[PDB]
Design a protein around this ligand. Structure first.
Ligand SMILES: [Zn+2]
Ligand SMILES: [Zn+2]
Ligand SMILES: [Zn+2]
Length: 572
């Protein structure tokens, strides 16, 4: 019960019992919280509740100190002191933003704005509160039970009445019962068990509600700037491949932390791996939120770094298949590749946190708590997709509010910027450079003359809420017949249901914009499907068109984004 105030650090025994995270609040700050919010339960060794038998007064403003015990206005002794007076709550050792973080439901964008513009301790409080809210929200959904099993990849489900049904996409990883984690896709539904098991009729599923641990470390450690490269030993025989980043690698050694904004295909993973060749003695821990981001870093390290000093840390509860070419779970290796949730408690000369737009402040804090490093490097792009905020339904979350690192990149600018896109044909580079990069992204490739756009609204149907546009898939079918080189294209859309239809009608491999992030393909066929806030999101649009190395076909619903595409227009 001895603690330190979340708003002022002043020691106290007072905790708000009405806050989902029960934060320590000092006398002057506990008062400002209880008098301005619906939160009236104050905790200590003993709660501030009426000691009179059978009395239910728990409100601190309606309670008093009668000797050593607490009583309400109806039960207090003549010699008693109100717990709330002179702007203070009685306690040992004797805010507008804190109130809003403590009481909000996390369904509005303004809640996330606040959680990123507040003080550093309030950023951790917001992160802890939000994650706890997100996990209690998992209980609200209805249990799905296996009703029948057709084959090895298709089944039929029975849902719990009264309780709502969670949206069916690979974004919601279920838990089958402990018969392995399971994922679902849309009566013909597809069952995807992470662990191969004979799908039993009657076995129930439940969403993975994990316990939210407290945050101790800040999202960002305080910045230090040095006059010399500190604790890192460079080479003067740095391969000409990585010569373009020599000045930026030196900046990495002359600051506690550095931010790198890398638009698509500008060399983020080449920069990350080249940092190891530049400081060849440095123990580097490469971390990211997803297994895919960590695997993409493993793939680049396999080409440049010695395999015997690399280790891929895999959690014992192995969910999806990941990188198999490094020695598994050897924490002591010079190069450690591991997701944020699987990180061991260790130190490093450098920590590289990749795909920073996908990090939450909870992840930023966990990294600082599990890894003590001389230097931290944050690589990503605030013009790319952020982590899904399952509770956010109202308002659009801007890139400066994704996390602390993204807030810095959007406000003061990134420390390092990779300005040349080597992946995409110039049509794509020019479009996104003007859309999200203030005309600072340059094309390495020439125009491919294989970038097409078609303005075709089609017909929007819905699979619950996930959208389908069969006419847009029909336009793609007609195009494929005339453009056989496009037979090898990846179909991309902002919807799983659109992708499921396109996969059957076109036979092209399919990918949502969100799951395509970090991947590249020679040819991409994109159907916008609808003109909603989701499908018009400039960050999602940016990720969608920048997957293409050679050609892109964009079947558009929105006139604005269609007019911004610097592509050859097609008729029909
Ligand atoms: Zn305080
Ligand atoms: Zn509270
Ligand atoms: Zn009472």
């Amino acid at each position: 019960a001895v603690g330190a105030c979340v708003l002022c650090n002043s020691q106290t025994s007072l905790r708000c019992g009405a806050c989902i995270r029960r934060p320590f609040l000092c006398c002057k700050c506990c008062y400002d919280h209880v008098i301005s919010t619906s939160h009236k339960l104050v905790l200590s060794v003993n709660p501030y509740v009426c000691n009179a038998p059978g009395c239910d007064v728990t409100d601190v403003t309606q309670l008093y100190l009668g000797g050593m015990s607490y009583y309400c206005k109806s039960h207090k002794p003549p010699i008693s002191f109100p717990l709330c007076a002179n702007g203070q709550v009685f306690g040992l050792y004797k805010v507008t933003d804190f109130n809003a973080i403590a009481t909000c439901d996390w369904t509005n964008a303004g809640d996330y704005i606040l959680a990123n513009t507040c003080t550093e301790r309030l950023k951790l409080f917001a992160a802890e509160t939000l994650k706890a809210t997100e996990e209690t929200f998992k209980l609200s959904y209805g249990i799905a039970t296996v009703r029948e099993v057709l084959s090895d990849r298709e089944l039929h489900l029975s849902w719990e009445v009264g309780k709502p049904r969670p949206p069916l996409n690979r974004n919601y990883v279920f838990t089958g019962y402990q018969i392995g984690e399971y994922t679902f896709e849309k009566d013909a539904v597809v069952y995807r068990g992470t662990t191969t098991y004979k799908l039993n009729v009657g076995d129930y599923f439940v969403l993975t509600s994990h316990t939210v641990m407290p945050l101790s470390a800040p999202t960002l450690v305080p910045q230090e700037h040095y006059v010399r490269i500190t604790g890192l030993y460079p080479t003067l025989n740095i391969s000409d491949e990585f010569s373009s980043n020599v000045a930026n690698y030196q900046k990495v050694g002359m600051q506690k932390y550095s931010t790198l904004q890398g638009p698509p295909g500008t060399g983020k993973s080449h920069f990350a791996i080249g940092l190891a060749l530049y400081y060849p003695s440095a123990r580097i821990v490469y971390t990211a939120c997803s297994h895919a981001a960590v695997d993409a870093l493993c793939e680049k390290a396999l080409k440049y770094l010695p395999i015997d000093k690399c280790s891929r840390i895999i959690p014992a509860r192995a969910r999806v298949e990941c990188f198999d070419k490094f020695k598994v779970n050897s924490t002591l290796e010079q190069y450690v590749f591991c997701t944020v949730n699987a990180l061991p408690e260790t130190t490093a000369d450098i920590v590289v946190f990749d795909e920073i737009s996908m990090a939450t402040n909870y992840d930023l804090s966990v990294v600082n708590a599990r890894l003590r490093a001389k230097h931290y490097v944050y690589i990503g792009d605030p013009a790319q997709l952020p982590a899904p905020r399952t509770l956010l339904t109202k308002g659009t979350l801007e890139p400066e509010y994704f996390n602390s690192v993204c807030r810095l990149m959007k406000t003061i600018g990134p420390d390092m910027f990779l300005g040349t896109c080597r992946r995409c044909p110039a049509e794509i580079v020019d479009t996104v450079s003007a859309l999200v990069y203030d005309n600072k992204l340059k094309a390495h490739k020439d125009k491919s003359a294989q970038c097409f756009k078609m303005f075709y609204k089609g017909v929007i149907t819905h699979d619950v809420s996930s959208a389908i546009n069969r006419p847009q898939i029909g336009v793609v079918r007609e195009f494929l017949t005339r453009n056989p080189a496009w037979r090898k294209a990846v179909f991309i859309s902002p919807y799983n249901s659109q992708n499921a239809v396109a996969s059957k009608i076109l036979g092209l491999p399919t990918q949502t914009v969100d799951s395509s992030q970090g991947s590249e393909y020679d040819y991409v066929i994109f159907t916008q499907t609808t003109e909603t806030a989701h499908s018009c999101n400039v960050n999602r649009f940016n990720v969608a068109i920048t997957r293409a190395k050679v050609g892109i076909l964009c079947i558009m619903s929105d006139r604005d984004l269609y007019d911004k595409l610097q592509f050859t227009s097609l008729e029909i």
